[PDB]
Amino acid sequence: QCFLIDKNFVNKAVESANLTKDDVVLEIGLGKGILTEELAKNAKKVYVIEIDKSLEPYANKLKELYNNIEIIWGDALKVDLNKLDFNKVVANLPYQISSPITFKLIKRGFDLAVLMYQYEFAKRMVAAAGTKDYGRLSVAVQSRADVEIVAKVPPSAFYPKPKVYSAIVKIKPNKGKYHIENENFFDDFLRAIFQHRNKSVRKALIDSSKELNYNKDEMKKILEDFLNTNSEIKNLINEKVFKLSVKDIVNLSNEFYRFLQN
């Protein structure tokens, strides 16, 4: 249990969330309620999902001062987020749940999130194409949202003191930017190519053909056929996986899905 104890980083997170009294905020983790209090002050209402019932006295004290806090006791990975009406998410995330929670939240949808991650995880999220930290996580996030690191957060800001830095990350979903033909196929396509990130897209797809439910020979012939559709496709699939931009991977998988359909 890491608790964010530096009010200055609370402030930075809240300021970045651009809150008004029309906003409804989901917070993951109660902690000592320091972030919770700031959210309650500035938002219409705050939902807090907290797993540890020993923290109830913090919740209880807060609810005496604020009438717009609702506590949900449970695991945030299990809570049905469809049943909650919020537009923003602000949280010092338990790092253990970083990846699954991020995608469950984006799936549900929101206007804006400002979330604490471990610094290396944050770097991967925001990494530019063709760089050393660019990978599946980068494309999976950036294809669905604009993301940026607001601030690096030192271990001294938490208690107990962590081993590594954290980072505040701002996430603005953008449902219109890249346009995805089929989410399931896109997820499988991403999983296949990034299993071989230093190979050409062509070779990655053949090596990991079973992820897309084709055999290796089938996949070879498919890609021979696919490459002959246009010159843009040829140059994309011949390029190393990690060098393709998010835009290019989305378009490529879109064109590939339709090719496989037709």
Ligand SMILES: Nc1ncnc2c1ncn2[C@@H]1O[C@H](CO)[C@@H](O)[C@H]1O
């Ligand atoms: N899976 C989880 N769901 C909800 N809250 C959690 C989970 N794991 C840890 N927490 C809580 O989040 C906070 C981490 O800062 C702590 O209050 C901790 O109890």
